[PDB]
Amino acid sequence: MRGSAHVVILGAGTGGMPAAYEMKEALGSGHEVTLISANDYFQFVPSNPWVGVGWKERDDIAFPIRHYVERKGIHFIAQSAEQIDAEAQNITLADGNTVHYDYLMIATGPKLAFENVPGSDPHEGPVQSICTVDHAERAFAEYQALLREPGPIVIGAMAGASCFGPAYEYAMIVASDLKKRGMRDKIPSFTFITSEPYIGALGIQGVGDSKGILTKGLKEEGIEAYTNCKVTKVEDNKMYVTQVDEKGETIKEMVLPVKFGMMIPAFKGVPAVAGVEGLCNPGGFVLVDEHQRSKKYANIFAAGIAIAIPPVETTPVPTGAPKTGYMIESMVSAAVHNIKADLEGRKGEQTMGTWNAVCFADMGDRGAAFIALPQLKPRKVDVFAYGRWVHLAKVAFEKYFIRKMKMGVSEPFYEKVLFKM
Amino acid sequence: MRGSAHVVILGAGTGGMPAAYEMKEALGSGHEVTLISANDYFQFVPSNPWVGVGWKERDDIAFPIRHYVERKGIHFIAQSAEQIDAEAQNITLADGNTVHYDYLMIATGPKLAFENVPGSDPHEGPVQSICTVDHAERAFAEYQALLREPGPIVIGAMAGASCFGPAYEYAMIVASDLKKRGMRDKIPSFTFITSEPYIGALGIQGVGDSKGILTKGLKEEGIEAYTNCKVTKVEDNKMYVTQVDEKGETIKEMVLPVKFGMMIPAFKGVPAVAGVEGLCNPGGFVLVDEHQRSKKYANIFAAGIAIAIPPVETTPVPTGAPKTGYMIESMVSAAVHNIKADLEGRKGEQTMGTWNAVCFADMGDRGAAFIALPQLKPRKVDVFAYGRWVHLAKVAFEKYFIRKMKMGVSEPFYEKVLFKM
Ligand SMILES: Cc1cc2nc3c(=O)[nH]c(=O)nc-3n(C[C@H](O)[C@H](O)[C@H](O)COP(=O)(O)OP(=O)(O)OC[C@H]3O[C@@H](n4cnc5c(N)ncnc54)[C@H](O)[C@@H]3O)c2cc1C
Ligand SMILES: Cc1cc2nc3c(=O)[nH]c(=O)nc-3n(C[C@H](O)[C@H](O)[C@H](O)COP(=O)(O)OP(=O)(O)OC[C@H]3O[C@@H](n4cnc5c(N)ncnc54)[C@H](O)[C@@H]3O)c2cc1C
Ligand SMILES: CCCCCCCCCCCCO[C@@H]1O[C@H](CO)[C@@H](O[C@H]2O[C@H](CO)[C@@H](O)[C@H](O)[C@H]2O)[C@H](O)[C@H]1O
Ligand SMILES: CCCCCCCCCCCCO[C@@H]1O[C@H](CO)[C@@H](O[C@H]2O[C@H](CO)[C@@H](O)[C@H](O)[C@H]2O)[C@H](O)[C@H]1O
Ligand SMILES: CCCCCCCCCCC1=C(C)C(=O)C(OC)=C(OC)C1=O
Ligand SMILES: CCCCCCCCCCC1=C(C)C(=O)C(OC)=C(OC)C1=O
Ligand SMILES: [S]
Ligand SMILES: [S]
Ligand SMILES: [S]
Ligand SMILES: [S]
Ligand SMILES: [S]
Ligand SMILES: [S]
Numbered sequence: 001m002r003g004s005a006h007v008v009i010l011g012a013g014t015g016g017m018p019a020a021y022e023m024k025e026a027l028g029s030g031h032e033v034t035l036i037s038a039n040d041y042f043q044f045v046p047s048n049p050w051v052g053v054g055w056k057e058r059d060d061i062a063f064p065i066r067h068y069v070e071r072k073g074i075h076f077i078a079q080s081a082e083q084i085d086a087e088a089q090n091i092t093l094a095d096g097n098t099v100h101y102d103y104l105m106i107a108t109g110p111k112l113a114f115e116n117v118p119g120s121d122p123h124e125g126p127v128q129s130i131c132t133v134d135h136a137e138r139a140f141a142e143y144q145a146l147l148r149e150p151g152p153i154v155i156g157a158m159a160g161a162s163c164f165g166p167a168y169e170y171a172m173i174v175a176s177d178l179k180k181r182g183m184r185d186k187i188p189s190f191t192f193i194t195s196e197p198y199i200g201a202l203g204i205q206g207v208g209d210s211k212g213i214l215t216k217g218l219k220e221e222g223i224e225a226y227t228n229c230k231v232t233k234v235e236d237n238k239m240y241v242t243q244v245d246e247k248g249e250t251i252k253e254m255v256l257p258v259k260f261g262m263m264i265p266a267f268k269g270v271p272a273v274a275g276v277e278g279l280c281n282p283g284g285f286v287l288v289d290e291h292q293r294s295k296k297y298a299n300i301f302a303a304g305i306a307i308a309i310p311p312v313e314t315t316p317v318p319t320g321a322p323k324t325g326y327m328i329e330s331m332v333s334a335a336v337h338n339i340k341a342d343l344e345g346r347k348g349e350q351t352m353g354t355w356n357a358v359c360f361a362d363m364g365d366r367g368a369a370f371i372a373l374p375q376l377k378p379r380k381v382d383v384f385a386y387g388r389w390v391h392l393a394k395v396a397f398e399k400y401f402i403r404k405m406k407m408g409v410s411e412p413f414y415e416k417v418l419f420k421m
Numbered sequence: 422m423r424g425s426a427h428v429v430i431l432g433a434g435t436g437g438m439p440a441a442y443e444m445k446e447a448l449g450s451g452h453e454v455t456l457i458s459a460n461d462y463f464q465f466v467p468s469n470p471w472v473g474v475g476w477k478e479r480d481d482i483a484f485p486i487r488h489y490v491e492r493k494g495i496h497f498i499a500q501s502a503e504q505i506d507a508e509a510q511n512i513t514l515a516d517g518n519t520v521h522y523d524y525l526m527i528a529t530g531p532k533l534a535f536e537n538v539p540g541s542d543p544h545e546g547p548v549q550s551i552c553t554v555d556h557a558e559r560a561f562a563e564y565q566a567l568l569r570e571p572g573p574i575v576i577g578a579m580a581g582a583s584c585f586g587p588a589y590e591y592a593m594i595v596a597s598d599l600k601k602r603g604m605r606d607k608i609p610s611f612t613f614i615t616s617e618p619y620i621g622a623l624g625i626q627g628v629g630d631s632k633g634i635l636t637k638g639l640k641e642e643g644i645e646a647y648t649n650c651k652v653t654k655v656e657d658n659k660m661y662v663t664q665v666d667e668k669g670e671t672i673k674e675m676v677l678p679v680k681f682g683m684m685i686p687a688f689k690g691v692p693a694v695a696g697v698e699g700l701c702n703p704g705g706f707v708l709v710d711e712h713q714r715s716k717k718y719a720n721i722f723a724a725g726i727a728i729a730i731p732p733v734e735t736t737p738v739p740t741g742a743p744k745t746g747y748m749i750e751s752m753v754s755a756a757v758h759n760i761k762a763d764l765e766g767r768k769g770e771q772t773m774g775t776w777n778a779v780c781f782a783d784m785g786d787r788g789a790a791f792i793a794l795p796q797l798k799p800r801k802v803d804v805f806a807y808g809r810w811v812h813l814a815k816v817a818f819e820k821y822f823i824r825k826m827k828m829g830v831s832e833p834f835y836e837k838v839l840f841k842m
Binding site: 208209353354356373377378379380381382383385386387388389392393419420421 | 629630774775777794798799800801802803804806807808809810813814840841842
């Protein structure tokens with residue numbers, strides 16, 4: 001309302017949860033902050049692959065949101081938005097109720113575009129997903145069924161995927177778990193299928209020796225790897241794969257039987273957001289400026305996977321660059337800062353800063369991680385790390401982030417670089 | 422004088438030059454700041470190996486100090502201190518003149534302890550040094566003499582050395598330059614001799630895959646490598662080497678003819694500092710507390726290679742951990758802050774922060790670099806990088822640091838991490 005702006009955060013994920021806390025902290029008691037999300041629980045998504053192989057469980061990585069945000073004076077509505085009317089500034093929820101906003105911050109993350117590959121939906125066939133805890137649990141269930149009746153395994157990443165690390169991680173921990181159960185020899189074939197132009201390209205033209213290290217990794221586990229692939233369909237428990245060369249010319253088609261599979265899907269924007277006229281690009285990602293403000297609606301901001309970021313390269317099979325946590329948090333920070341500025345008469349000048357990608361993968365005893373920035377080469381930082389210390393770092397960070405999500409954020413969040421001072 | 426403390430910085434190196442600027446900035450016009458150093462010029466020491474192979478020249482990496490510090494109101498005396506009387510607080514210069522201080526900040530760096538290995542002094546035989554520009558020029562001169570009359574090459578690091586990166590860098594660029602001149606095949610043998618327990622230990626138990634990468638590097642250049650070595654003497658143009666196993670038992674002695682050689686020497690504290698009663702450990706390194714304050718004299722502080730840092734491991738042949746630039750600068754910052762606090766009645770609480778090592782080596786087209794912290798494993802960061810981007814980074818940093826040394830520092834110096842914002 002006038003004099004007392006009502007700010008709505010859509011989506012309680014890696015960007016949205018911090019956003020709700022940071023917004024309430026920035027605005028204070030004279031403004032209503034409302035968090036709206038499709039689930040009543042937060043989940044730490046980097047841990048989903050471990051759930052998918054049975055090394056973690058839901059209770060380890062997920063917790064109900066309501067109590068934690070509400071003790072901070074944030075209103076919480078555990079309902080999916082089905083429609084957004086940007087003219088009236090009304091959000092229609094799944095139950096038919098509608099919520100008005102003065103400012104809207106979209107943090108709705110990815111729509112998992114299984115429809116791109118007919119039959120690839122986890123409820124449609126043997127190719128599963130570890131992108132969410134619901135899917136990871138379903139993946140583990142199918143993994144156990146594999147254990148009862150061993151057959152070919154196929155793991156990898158679809159055309160248009162942008163999040164490749166988890167495919168490599170999952171393949172490695174599946175290989176590892178299989179050996180631990182004394183079952184690895186019962187698997188007739190173990191194949192890795194990716195849209196990357198080469199192993200370890202990772203949607204970012206590689207980082208450090210990611211190519212050499214990931215290639216060696218898969219070879220060590222006896223995993224046969226194919227790049228420049230797209231899957232045209234999953235059908236009759238078979239994966240239909242088309243492989244091209246650099247020039248896009250088909251060099252072979254394959255038909256792979258799949259007893260147990262997991263392919264990272266391509267991401268699009270969620271339908272309620274994509275469905276806002278003039279808001280998004282054709283992929284359904286919010287078109288924003290450097291201040292995280294929508295190009296069309298001055299009072300709509302966005303952060304996280306939901307925003308559109310232009311590609312800097314094009315690969316034989318379409319792939320995308322990932323949007324990762326440190327950069328997501330810089331977007332959230334900018335958006336919060338600039339909404340507050342707006343509320344006080346100014347155009348906020350804060351930006352996301354420099355593009356970067358950071359990822360951590362834990363194989364059990366040892367981890368792998370990378371930092372790349374900026375997006376185009378030659379970079380200012382381009383580093384790949386491996387070792388026990390990396391595993392310890394992931395474990396520590398998960399523990400930290402989950403606690404922060406329960407306790408609340410102020411907060412120039414990454415003061416977790418104080419490990420220097 | 423009372424009410425107007427006189428602060429003296431001893432040594433105009435990587436720590437001392439920033440220190441003089443930062444001290445004057447912190448204290449202002451009501452206090453005299455005096456910089457005293459053995460040379461009238463600053464040199465960028467990471468570039469010395471390139472001077473040693475003729476890829477850089479003195480004028481590229483060195484410049485006269487006087488004009489630059491004096492325009493900042495800093496007094497400059499281009500004279501070695503020969504004696505320090507900590508009771509009277511008088512420094513006796515080489516010319517007999519004496520300078521009084523109220524606070525003294527020691528930044529005198531290393532004494533190159535050639536005397537540990539009889540015959541190893543650069544003016545005594547064929548084993549040269551690239552630790553200073555004077556030595557690097559002399560090394561290049563001897564390199565050209567090698568070119569006229571090819572013979573065995575021996576490069577590496579003495580027992581007690583703590584700065585290993587430059588030995589690897591120098592060996593690599595020497596190998597590289599030799600091929601460029603079409604002369605590499607004229608060299609009968611090319612040997613790398615180190616006190617490290619293994620190749621790429623680097624006085625810090627390795628970092629990232631430093632062992633694998635450096636081993637492969639030397640092998641590619643046809644350089645034969647020997648670890649766990651100490652040199653007992655250089656004589657008759659031969660290097661006498663003793664090699665032990667893990668337990669310190671001699672497994673062989675070698676006698677290597679040397680036409681052209683370069684061995685990183687062990688570091689001690691400079692004689693004027695070591696000679697202060699109760700100031701230093703037996704190595705001649707200043708015993709300081711966490712605030713960079715001398716344990717004995719409340720008004721003596723120290724930073725850089727000059728301070729004593731306890732070892733965390735012991736290797737078959739004694740080696741030390743390096744003291745590198747980012748940590749040196751944190752020491753300088755702490756010392757400046759705490760001297761100012763003292764001047765204003767308080768005990769400053771600022772510390773060096775977390776131990777870390779950072780190094781950059783440039784091989785011409787591509788660089789190598791590492792970050793390790795803290796000192797003991799498992800670390801929080803333990804990363805090794807290689808590539809063209811690393812070469813570009815070194816070139817950029819050298820250019821930046823030299824400019825800053827001419828323009829002056831305020832300054833939370835490493836805001837050069839703003840490449841993020
Ligand atoms: C398996 C996997 C591993 C990853 N590992 C890393 C890593 O090691 N490091 C790193 O920095 N990044 C990692 N990421 C990438 C990234 O950081 C995450 O995907 C992160 O969760 C994205 O944050 P987000 O806020 O944009 O989207 P999300 O975290 O997916 O949150 C989006 C949210 O909004 C909701 N929502 C969607 N539609 C609606 C609607 N119509 N109405 C209401 N709510 C809605 C969701 O239910 C959800 O809570 C990983 C991603 C995956 C899939
Ligand atoms: C070949 C080489 C390569 C290196 N590369 C790197 C790198 O890539 N990254 C990194 O972080 N570090 C690097 N270092 C390590 C380190 O950072 C440097 O050695 C650095 O110069 C040390 O700073 P300092 O102020 O302690 O000593 P120095 O820079 O040696 O300065 C000491 C100074 O005080 C003086 N002095 C000595 N005695 C007296 C006296 N009695 N009276 C007056 N003045 C005196 C000197 O003449 C000199 O100016 C390298 C070192 C070497 C030798
Ligand atoms: C987070 C994003 C990244 C993608 C997800 C994960 C990818 C899968 C990881 C495969 C790694 C397997 O292969 C592993 O790699 C490294 C090579 O650097 C080797 O390790 C080597 O370098 C490391 C340091 O980095 C040293 O500590 C080690 O002593 C050395 O042998 C391991 O001996 C090998 O077992
Ligand atoms: C600064 C402190 C370090 C010590 C000083 C310098 C040590 C000497 C460097 C020797 C390196 C030589 O060997 C070189 O190493 C790397 C291995 O990671 C290889 O490079 C490999 O990883 C890099 C990324 O890190 C990739 O970009 C590259 O495509 C891949 O092949 C090079 O193909 C090889 O030529
Ligand atoms: C120098 C520029 C890069 C700074 C990044 C520092 C690394 C800190 C942890 C990285 C991380 C982030 C940010 C993160 O958001 C995240 O969750 C999605 C992780 O997974 C466990 C991470 O490992
Ligand atoms: C995360 C903790 C480590 C931070 C270090 C950031 C790297 C910036 C440059 C490093 C560097 C420093 C500090 C430095 O002082 C120095 O000169 C001795 C270099 O040689 C060229 C360097 O490459
Ligand atoms: S990734
Ligand atoms: S590439
Ligand atoms: S990631
Ligand atoms: S080093
Ligand atoms: S070690
Ligand atoms: S270094």
